[PDB]
Amino acid sequence: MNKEILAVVEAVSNEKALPREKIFEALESALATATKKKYEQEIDVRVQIDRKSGDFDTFRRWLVVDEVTQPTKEITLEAARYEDESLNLGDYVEDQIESVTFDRITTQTAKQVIVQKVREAERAMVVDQFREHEGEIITGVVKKVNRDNISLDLGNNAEAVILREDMLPRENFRPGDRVRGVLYSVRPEARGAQLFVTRS
Amino acid sequence: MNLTELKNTPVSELITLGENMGLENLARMRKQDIIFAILKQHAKSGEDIFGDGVLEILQDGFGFLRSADSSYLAGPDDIYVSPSQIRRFNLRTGDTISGKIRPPKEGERYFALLKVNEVNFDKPENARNKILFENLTPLHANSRLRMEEDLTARVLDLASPIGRGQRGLIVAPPKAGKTMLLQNIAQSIAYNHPDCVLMVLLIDERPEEVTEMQRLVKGEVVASTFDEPASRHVQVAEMVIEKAKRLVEHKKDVIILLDSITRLARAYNTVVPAKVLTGGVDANALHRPKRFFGAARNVEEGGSLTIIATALIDTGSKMDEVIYEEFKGTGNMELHLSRKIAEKR
Amino acid sequence: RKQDIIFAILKQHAKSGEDIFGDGVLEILQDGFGFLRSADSSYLAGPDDIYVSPSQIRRFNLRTGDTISGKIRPPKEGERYFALLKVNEVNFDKPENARNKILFENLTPLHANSRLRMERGNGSTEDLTARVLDLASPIGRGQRGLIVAPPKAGKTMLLQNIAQSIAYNHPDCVLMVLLIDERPEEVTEMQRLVKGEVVASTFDEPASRHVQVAEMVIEKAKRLVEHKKDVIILLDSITRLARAYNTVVPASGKVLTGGVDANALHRPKRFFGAARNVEEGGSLTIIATALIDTGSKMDEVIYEEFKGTGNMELHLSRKIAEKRVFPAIDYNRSGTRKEELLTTQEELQKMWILRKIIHPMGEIDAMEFLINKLAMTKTNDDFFEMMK
Amino acid sequence: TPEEKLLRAIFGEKASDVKDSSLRVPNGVSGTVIDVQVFTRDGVEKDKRA
RNA sequence: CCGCACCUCGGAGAGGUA
């Protein structure tokens, strides 16, 4: 049994930073990223471990598709024929499990992923506190000007974004300008949700 | 297009309607998912969607419109109530809100409220300007609620006459006739006074007795069997008392037929954070049910709140005896039943 | 834009030969020279700051915090700041009076002697907060207390009431409300509400400016105390200031429980303990608001460390605040040490009797009793006379 | 952040900004290793090869 | 990671090769 990661997931957790599930998700995502950066021409490798005593196993997966794009991570429907073609397009999980490769140097990016997910959890806590103390017009500072989206800043490890369709068509913003906007909903964006703000 | 109307339709008609609308196979699907898909497809057409439910404001600020047919249980089809609308319309727990709702967008799980059409079965202009329940002057029972299967009601009327705003305690040992007496009381309330809001609040009871009581009396029966935790019992009790207070503020005669003197007390004692008294009851565990009981009162400006509870003594636990002895000093009506007469049928 | 216009106007005026006047608080740098920061910019480094030569600093023994007002000149070819030619007024006084002064480090501290009564006396319903504060924890000159309260307890309203009562009863005291790492709208609201000086440093800038503004404020307060002034600082940032110091402190390898550095609490504890009552003249009162139950153990450790420092704690109850009962003060947890030096014998006996009667009752019950007893009259004297 | 070094001190897992500075063989030259010497400063603990 | 205990990638010098 891997007592090293077990002591970490048992001790560091339970302090509102690790909910016993996001910590395991971050650890398996970091292991997957390490295995991806280890191979040269083999991308999109995943790993799932959701048990204390149970060790982790690296099962490289392919993308089920009827085309030949990305020949390094694509598989055909004849491999799903064993399941009577039940594997619909858009879902990619099936393959034989291969040899796992654990190492102490792989913890470098693992710690980075862990602290990034802790920062994301702290951002979620700040969002919860904002919702607890919402109901007033706020001001924010823009950071970047992307396509059909801007950003807001309130320096308490918080952040907000405004959709361009909700803003004025004539007004274009620039970093350093204060923006007045009331937030109404938070959609679950990938790699962490973000508070969406609307003016119209 | 109403939420409760679709939730009351049978499964066969919903599956048929969904197959006619041309959606995914609804035979191997839950009824809630069927209703959700039907509402989504109907909103995509352009028609409006309406809903209703009792408001339950969460700690984060927002609230949900709990449905009555689900015994005030958090469901996937709850109507999300933004804190902005709560601050605008001065919404509180118990305010039944009915208005135009919309299916949740991509990434959401609750229906959003756009415009409220009716507040507590009345115009919103009459609800925004109202007198709080704490300001209403309490008074003793003035109007007589005559209960005159009728033999039990006659004996109850001859022993302790119950009126509007009464606060009684039906004290009886186990196997003394509490079930039949409660059934007779509910039938008499539904028959003599159909205008009153009869709510048979059951907590930690048998599911067969619950479904027998609900499909027998002519009214609303919100219950919570033993399969649910004590937190849900406390939440249902709070929702019931808040709805009753709001209806009394709207000049309604509510009758909380409570049968959870011991069950709700044990629930509060289990959910209260850790002062040890006799029987294992915390010092701050009986305050919430004490206020729940004392909420019943007669209002001179309009409306009344009557709560007729049933006590449980001689249950083998001194905790129940202490709870009964504490709650006896709060009310003003005790109807004791004899076990010797009940055992002789 | 206004600064450049003023710069050009001063240049054009100096070209004619007239004199130019300036003012500002001195900030001596580590290299030996310093600049005269402006008050309207919350002591922020500006392009038009007045340069101070080390020669004048040695001549007048100037230090950080000394208010300097005198003749300035525009910069010449190769300069970027206003040179100070002759100083006219030092700390709102003549230099001959400021040269014979006693340093703040040599002043003998003492306990609170003078009574700073917070009661308004107008019989307003807002005066109930000040009345409860005076009945629970009397505040004197040189007091070093802490306002312990969880979030959403009523710190803003209580602070506003304290500031208004100070401006009403004691208009001679210099009130300075330093708000660090707060919202700009709250800063604007406070500045346009209280009758005094309001310096702030919002979160829009890093903690370096926070530390710099805190140092400038404490140095100005020390200089005013040296000039026999009664300075009162209401810093509701002590927790934020401790977080800033822990963030800007170099790593030493000894981190306490909760992410607190071993040498991070030195500067905020010194800032807190700087408050003291001077026997030779003047005093310094610092009323800070600590944050507890904020979900971070760092704030809990900071509160537990600062608890053993002050001599006054004003605990606020979350339940009473949620019940919308203001002021939501935990009367049982509040108190002041050496209170006999600020109250008479009969007043101390009445407070002791009131505490002995209130202690058995619960928090909400005691608050309701106190409110019902204070609503019967306008002044606390009638309440004291009726209690007997 | 001083919190990450506490975690690094909690578990034996290595975590640092590793840069490669190993002694490599110059180009062209080759041969067979015939002797290896290791000199360690006083106080520092020896390693397996040493 | 806060407390064990069940009643209703350089400069100088020396030597050498053509």
CATH number at residue A63: 3.30.1480.10
Report which residue type is found at B59.
Answer: Q
Q: Which of A98, A125, A152 is the last residue of a domain?
A: A125
A179 with A112, same domain: the answer is no
CA distances for B294 relative to B241, B307, B327, B328, angstroms: 11, 9, 10, 12
Q: Report the C-alpha gap between C115 and C130 in whole angstroms.
A: 14
Which residues 231-290 of chain C have a CB within 8 Å of chain D?
Answer: 251, 253, 255, 259, 261
Report residues 272-291 of B contacting strand E, contact meaning Cβ closer than 7 Å: 276, 278-280
Question: C168: which 2 tokens?
Answer: 């009403």
Eight-class DSSP state of B163: B
- A139 and C184 within 8 Å at the Cβ level: the answer is yes
What stretches of chain A show up as alpha helix (H) in DSSP? Answer: 3-11, 22-38, 77-80, 107-132
C315 with C341, same domain: the answer is yes
Reduce the DSSP state of residue D1 to 3 states and report it.
Answer: coil
Question: C236: which 2 tokens?
Answer: 């509701």
- B83 and A135 within 8 Å at the Cβ level: the answer is yes
Q: Which of C58, C78, C97 is the last residue of a domain?
A: C97
Protein residue with the closest CA to the C1' atom of nucleotide E1? A11
Query: Read out DSSP for D2-48?
Result: HHHHHHHHHSS---S--------PPSS-------------TTSPP-S
Q: Residue A192: which of A126, A121, A115, A143 has the closest Cα?
A: A121
Residue A182 contacts C, CB cutoff 8 Å: no
Residues of B in contact with A131 (CB under 8 A): 60-61
Q: Which of A109, A125, A141 is the last residue of a domain?
A: A125
- Whether C147 and C289 have beta carbons less than 8 Å apart is answered as yes
Give chain C's domain count. 2
- Whether C146 and C158 have beta carbons less than 8 Å apart is answered as no
Which residues lie below 8 Å from residue C231, measured CB to CB, with a gap of 6+? Answer: C173, C174, C176, C221, C224, C225, C282, C283, C284, C285
Q: Residue C226: which of C105, C109, C104, C62 has the closest Cα?
A: C104
Q: Report the C-alpha gap between C173 and C117 in whole angstroms.
A: 13
Q: Report the C-alpha gap between A100 and A47 in whole angstroms.
A: 10
Does residue A10 lie within 7 Å of nucleic acid chain E, judged by its CB? no
Question: Which chain D residue has its CA at the smallest distance from A9's CA?
Answer: D11
Maximal CA-CA distance, chain D: 48
Centre a 10 Å sphere on the Cβ of residue C137 and count the other Cβ atoms it contains. Answer: 22
C92 with C104, same domain: the answer is no
Q: Which of C46, C74, C97 is the last residue of a domain?
A: C97
Q: Report the C-alpha gap between C125 and C127 in whole angstroms.
A: 5
A146 with A115, same domain: the answer is no
Angle, to 10 degrees, between the axis of helix B287-294 and the axis of helix B263-271? 140
A118 with A175, same domain: the answer is no
Checking each nucleotide's C1' against the CA of D10, the nearest proves to be E1
Q: Report the C-alpha gap between B76 and B65 in whole angstroms.
A: 11
CA distances for B238 relative to B291, B293, C121, angstroms: 11, 12, 44
Beta bridge partners of C147: C289
Does residue A15 lie within 7 Å of nucleic acid chain E, judged by its CB? yes
A49 with A121, same domain: the answer is yes
Q: Report the C-alpha gap between B126 and C84 in whole angstroms.
A: 71
Q: Which of B61, B106, B107 sits opposite A134 (nearest CB)?
A: B61
Contacting subunits of A (3+ beta carbon pairs below 8 A):
B, C, D
Checking each nucleotide's C1' against the CA of C258, the nearest proves to be E1
Beta bridge partners of C25: C37, C67
Centre a 10 Å sphere on the Cβ of residue D35 and count the other Cβ atoms it contains. Answer: 4
Does residue A182 lie within 7 Å of nucleic acid chain E, judged by its CB? no
Residue A128 contacts B, CB cutoff 8 Å: yes
**Feature table: binding site of C:** 140-145, 152-157, 183
Query: Read out DSSP for B237-260?
Result: HHHHHHHHHHHHHTT-EEEEEE--
Does residue A17 lie within 7 Å of nucleic acid chain E, judged by its CB? yes
Reduce the DSSP state of residue B340 to 3 states and report it.
Answer: helix
Q: Residue C183: which of C167, C207, C165, C200 has the closest Cα?
A: C200
**Could you tell me whether strands C34-37 and B253-258 are parallel, antiparallel, or unpaired per DSSP bridges?**
unpaired
Reduce the DSSP state of residue B157 to 3 states and report it.
Answer: helix
A14 with A26, same domain: the answer is yes
Query: Read out DSSP for B58-115?
Result: -TTS-EEEE-TTTTS---TT-EEE-HHHHHHHT--TT--EEEEEE---TT--SEEEEE
Q: Report the C-alpha gap between B91 and B113 in whole angstroms.
A: 13
Question: Which chain C residue has its CA at the smallest distance from A138's CA?
Answer: C185
Q: Looking at chain A, after which residues does the C atom sit over 2.5 Å from the next written N, breaking the chain?
A: none
Q: In this complex, how many residue pairs, one in chain C and one in chain D, have their CB atoms less than 8 Å apart? A: 11
Q: Which of C203, C204, C295 sits opposite A125 (nearest CB)?
A: C295
Question: B246: which 2 tokens?
Answer: 């709001």
Half-sphere exposure at residue A81, Cβ-oriented, CA atoms within 13 angstroms: 6
Q: Report the C-alpha gap between C25 and C23 in whole angstroms.
A: 7
Question: C314: which 2 tokens?
Answer: 């004003």
Sign of the Cα torsion C28, C29, C32, C36 reads negative
- Measure D26 CA to E17 C1' (Å): 24
Q: Report the C-alpha gap between B129 and B242 in whole angstroms.
A: 18
A111 with A171, same domain: the answer is no
Sign of the Cα torsion A162, A168, A172, A176 reads negative
Centre a 10 Å sphere on the Cβ of residue B146 and count the other Cβ atoms it contains. Answer: 12
Expressed in angstroms, the distance from the first to the final Cα of chain A is: 57
Asked if chain A contacts chain C via 3 or more Cβ pairs within 8 Å, the reply is yes
Query: Read out DSSP for A135-171?
Result: -S-EEEE----BTTB--EEETTTEEEEEBTTTS-SS-
Q: Residue A77: which of A64, A63, A61 has the closest Cα?
A: A64
Checking each nucleotide's C1' against the CA of B276, the nearest proves to be E7
Question: Which chain C residue has its CA at the smallest distance from A16's CA?
Answer: C295
Provide the experimental method for this PDB entry: cryo-EM
Backbone angles phi, psi at A153, to 5 degrees: -140, 130
Residue B82 contacts A, CB cutoff 8 Å: yes
C359 with C333, same domain: the answer is yes
**Could you tell me whether strands C82-90 and C50-52 are parallel, antiparallel, or unpaired per DSSP bridges?**
parallel
Rg (CA), chain A: 22
How would you class A123 by CB atoms within 10 Å of its CB: exposed for 0-12, middle for 13-18, buried for 19 or more?
A: middle
Q: Report the C-alpha gap between C135 and A165 in whole angstroms.
A: 57
A56 with A113, same domain: the answer is yes
CA distances for C162 relative to B68, C69, C152, C170, C197, angstroms: 49, 32, 18, 11, 15
Å between A191 CA and nearest CA of chain C = 24
A75 with A169, same domain: the answer is no
CA distances for C192 relative to C120, C124, C154, C199, C210, angstroms: 20, 21, 19, 12, 22
Beta bridge partners of C84: C72
Checking each nucleotide's C1' against the CA of A16, the nearest proves to be E1
Centre a 10 Å sphere on the Cβ of residue C43 and count the other Cβ atoms it contains. Answer: 22
Q: Domain with A181 in it: what CATH number?
A: 2.40.50.140
Q: Which of B60, B87, B108 sits opposite A131 (nearest CB)?
A: B60
- B108 and A184 within 8 Å at the Cβ level: the answer is no
Which residues lie below 8 Å from residue C214, measured CB to CB, with a gap of 6+? Answer: C178, C180, C241, C271
How would you class A24 by CB atoms within 10 Å of its CB: exposed for 0-12, middle for 13-18, buried for 19 or more?
A: buried
Peptide bond into C109 cis (omega under 30): no
Centre a 10 Å sphere on the Cβ of residue C358 and count the other Cβ atoms it contains. Answer: 19
C90 with C114, same domain: the answer is no
C12 with C120, same domain: the answer is no
Residues in chain C: 388
Q: Which of C97, C117, C140 is the last residue of a domain?
A: C97
Report which residue type is found at C307.
Answer: K
Residue A184 contacts B, CB cutoff 8 Å: yes
Residues of D in contact with A12 (CB under 8 A): 7, 10
Expressed in angstroms, the distance from the first to the final Cα of chain B is: 51
Domain containing A105: what range? 3-125
- Whether C22 and C72 have beta carbons less than 8 Å apart is answered as yes
CA distances for B10 relative to A23, B14, B15, B34, angstroms: 44, 7, 9, 11
**Could you tell me whether strands B304-312 and B167-172 are parallel, antiparallel, or unpaired per DSSP bridges?**
parallel
Q: Report the C-alpha gap between B34 and A121 in whole angstroms.
A: 35
Residue D29 contacts A, CB cutoff 8 Å: no
Which residues 6-45 of chain D have a CB within 8 Å of chain C?
Answer: 6
- Measure B51 CA to E16 C1' (Å): 102
**Could you tell me whether strands B197-203 and B223-224 are parallel, antiparallel, or unpaired per DSSP bridges?**
parallel
Q: Residue B186: which of B256, B248, B242, B236 has the closest Cα?
A: B256
Reduce the DSSP state of residue A185 to 3 states and report it.
Answer: strand
Q: Report the C-alpha gap between C180 and C271 in whole angstroms.
A: 14
Q: Domain with B151 in it: what CATH number?
A: 3.40.50.300
Question: Which chain C residue has its CA at the smallest distance from A136's CA?
Answer: C185
How would you class A33 by CB atoms within 10 Å of its CB: exposed for 0-12, middle for 13-18, buried for 19 or more?
A: middle
Element (H, E) at B223: strand B223-224
Resolution in A: 3.8
Q: Residue B20: which of B38, B44, B39, B40 has the closest Cα?
A: B38
How would you class C168 by CB atoms within 10 Å of its CB: exposed for 0-12, middle for 13-18, buried for 19 or more?
A: middle
Q: Report the C-alpha gap between C95 and C92 in whole angstroms.
A: 9
Q: Which of A128, A139, A157 to mutate to test the interface with C (most CBs of C within 10 A)?
A: A139
Give chain A's domain count. 2
Question: C267: which 2 tokens?
Answer: 């500067």
- Whether B64 and B110 have beta carbons less than 8 Å apart is answered as yes
A105 with A138, same domain: the answer is no
The owner of tokens 């054009």 is C12
- Whether B300 and B139 have beta carbons less than 8 Å apart is answered as yes
- Whether C248 and C180 have beta carbons less than 8 Å apart is answered as no
Q: Residue C220: which of C171, C182, C274 has the closest Cα?
A: C274
C143 with C274, same domain: the answer is yes
Question: B25: which 2 tokens?
Answer: 């196979």
Q: Which of A132, A185, A188 sits opposite B61 (nearest CB)?
A: A132
Question: B338: which 2 tokens?
Answer: 């004899």
Q: Spell out the SS3 assignment of chain C.
A: CHHHHHHHHHHHHHHHCCCCEEEEEEEECCCCCEEEECCCCCCCCCCCCEEECHHHHHHHCCCCCCEEEEEEECCCCCCCCEEEEEEEEECCECHHHHCCCCCHHHCCEECCCCECCCCCCCCCCCHHHHHHHHHHCCCECCCEEEEEECCCCCHHHHHHHHHHHHHHHCCCCEEEEEEECCCHHHHHHHHCCCCCEEEEECCCCCHHHHHHHHHHHHHHHHHHHHCCCEEEECCCCHHHHHHHHHHHCCCCCCEECCCEECCCCHHHHHHHHCCCEECCCCEEEEEEEEECCCCCHHHHHHHHHHHCCCCEECCECHHHHHCCCCCCECCCCCEECCHHHCCCHHHHHHHHHHHHHHCCCCHHHHHHHHHHHHCCCCCHHHHHHHHC
Angle, to 10 degrees, between the axis of helix C363-374 and the axis of helix C380-387? 110
Q: Which of D1, D11, D14 sits opposite A8 (nearest CB)?
A: D11
Residue B61 contacts A, CB cutoff 8 Å: yes
Question: Which chain C residue has its CA at the smallest distance from A155's CA?
Answer: C203
Domain containing B196: what range? 138-344
Contacting subunits of B (3+ beta carbon pairs below 8 A):
A
Residues in chain A: 200
CA distances for C312 relative to C30, C142, C157, C289, angstroms: 36, 12, 19, 11
Centre a 10 Å sphere on the Cβ of residue A71 and count the other Cβ atoms it contains. Answer: 8
Element (H, E) at B55: strand B49-57
Backbone angles phi, psi at C237, to 5 degrees: -140, 0
* Four-CA torsion C92, C96, C100, C104, nearest 10 degrees: 20
